[PDB]
Amino acid sequence: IRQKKARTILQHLSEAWRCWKANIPWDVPGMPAPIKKIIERYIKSKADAWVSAAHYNRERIKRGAHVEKTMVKKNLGRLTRLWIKNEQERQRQIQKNGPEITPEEATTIFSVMVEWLESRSFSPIPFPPLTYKNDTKILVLALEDLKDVYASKVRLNASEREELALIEEAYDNPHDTLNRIKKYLLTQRVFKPVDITMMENYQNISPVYSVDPLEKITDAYLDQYLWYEADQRKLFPNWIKPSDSEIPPLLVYKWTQGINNLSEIWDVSRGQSAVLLETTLGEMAEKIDFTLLNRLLRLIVDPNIADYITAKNNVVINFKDMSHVNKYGLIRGLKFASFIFQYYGLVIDLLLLGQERATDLAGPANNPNEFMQFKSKEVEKAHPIRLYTRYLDRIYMLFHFEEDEGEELTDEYLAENPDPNFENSIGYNNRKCWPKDSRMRLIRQDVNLGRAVFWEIQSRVPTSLTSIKWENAFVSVYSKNNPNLLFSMCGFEVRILPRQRMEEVVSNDEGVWDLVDERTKQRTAKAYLKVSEEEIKKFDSRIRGILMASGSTTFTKVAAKWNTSLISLFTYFREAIVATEPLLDILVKGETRIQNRVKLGLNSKMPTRFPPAVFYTPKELGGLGMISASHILIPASDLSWSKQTDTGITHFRAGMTHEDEKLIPTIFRYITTWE
């Protein structure tokens, strides 16, 4: 063996490392088995360094501690190999070991849904006829929704410009493109492959699915049609959210009003207690099974569309070189994938609720309820599940237990799961954002009741459909020991404290909702708002992404990107900024990085060279037009004792300074409040 034969064998190594990155199995015919044993060994050596460096740098990026601009893109590319590789492993394990649902499970699941639709007397959605009265308007709504991307961006590639021309043809000849869409729903069952690209959000990496534009049009028409026909027929009940009737902060307001309005929720005269439950529904879209899914859709949709939908989920998935077929999981990137996800949500809702109580929540089919309304109080008093809603995969349940019912419920869990050491307080989780007095106290009676609540709910749903775990679960119990009912809505962290348990009544700043009973018109509870910690890190990730995308970008673009991100935070979070101290720190550190980006553009970071007149003057006078949020005295009060109780605002930390004093106004004044 010479310098020639040693030169060719090092190719197989380079080729096989590409194959491992591609997740393509590397097999060379006629390769000697000792050498193939050697090469596979060093790849797995290199694989461990390739994977562990990818883990180690994600922990750096989430901390935010000095990651190079190239290293962010490299780590973005390393994860999306690993995520799709984990996806392709999971597809093969389902294929080898069969569907995760057992045939007894799927029979019961199907029987529940048939019983619900028959109880509602739901009539199935037909295929859209050739003469359809709303056919031109629904087609327009789909194309406008596809069009709304284009007005924003300037330059377009070939696939974008193809998608322009296809929509423009559909404007010109609506009747011609309707017949084409009606044809593809009938006949087409094999589709073009779909590209995954991943968005970097610095705390997670999120998938974005690109559908071929000719297929994208007929999906968008189908989506507009199915959502309209479902709402005409009132398919989805009131608990399924978002309503299309309310914004997510109004959703928090009605829900928090809805807890207060329900009778006797605050009374702890007897031993009765109130429980709110929060879980994610796990990988809900990921665990959908198509054979179950096609069988479920035939109840409600004409089978030609239901055959289209199931075939549309099964497509080839393409990364830069890797490719696999989605045998199992739901593609969320489809335009009609919202309709599957909420409908598969309805099946899970019936499993938790049961056939009887879901009728009470929805009301009768002729006169369905409001989102928090029952027909009579006696309907309300039965069956301890008081309020229910489901945002997407987040589940919110409100339980009211009598002392007898709570004791029965908690003993049988201790029967099934005992604790001699009484370590139920250890694995429990609650909000660490609130003070220690203010968060839920770990009284062993209430903690045992909270776990018994979750254990009842976890048993109702099979693990094959969704993964419901205690670690994702947030349960709060209201009792004589706990005057605080805690939950987390879309981005809000809410403390609901009733008026009589307040132990003194003080006026509050406007970060406090006053909850009104409907029949008294008297304010009988106070809802306390904070921005969730997850949303704070999410806003910090946006500021980083503005800075990281802008290499040598002009000053007015960076200022405009700051304004549109700052308004998006403040207009959505209007009433929960004021309580949250950590968000106010991120607003200061965020805004001064934008000002440093201008100060990096010029070669001086000096303070006196840049008076606040430079940044905050409007564009019509030549300034950047930056919108201010951090020229604010930030409340500082005694971090040793602020974890214990709510100290109140006793001292003010300075937010932003300059040599020359200017009292720059802040938008929170200029945005009228949610309540």
């Binding site: 064998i9 080729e15 060379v28 390769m31 294929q95 569907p99 799927a106 029979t107 054979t291 069988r295």
Partner: protein
């Protein structure tokens, strides 16, 4: 003896190498069978 390495990604000398040289065996288990039949049997029971 070692085969020569023909790669799908790189071609440094730009060689024209035949299409077979550039570029499963199992069946489904009965879990997919018994799933589909139980869904049909639940369906026909629902129709009746």
């Amino acid at each position: 003896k070692i085969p020569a390495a023909v790669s799908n990604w790189k071609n440094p000398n730009g060689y024209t190498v035949a299409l077979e040289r550039r570029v499963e065996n199992n069946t489904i288990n009965d879990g997919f069978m018994k799933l589909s039949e139980a869904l049909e049997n639940a369906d026909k029971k629902a129709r009746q």
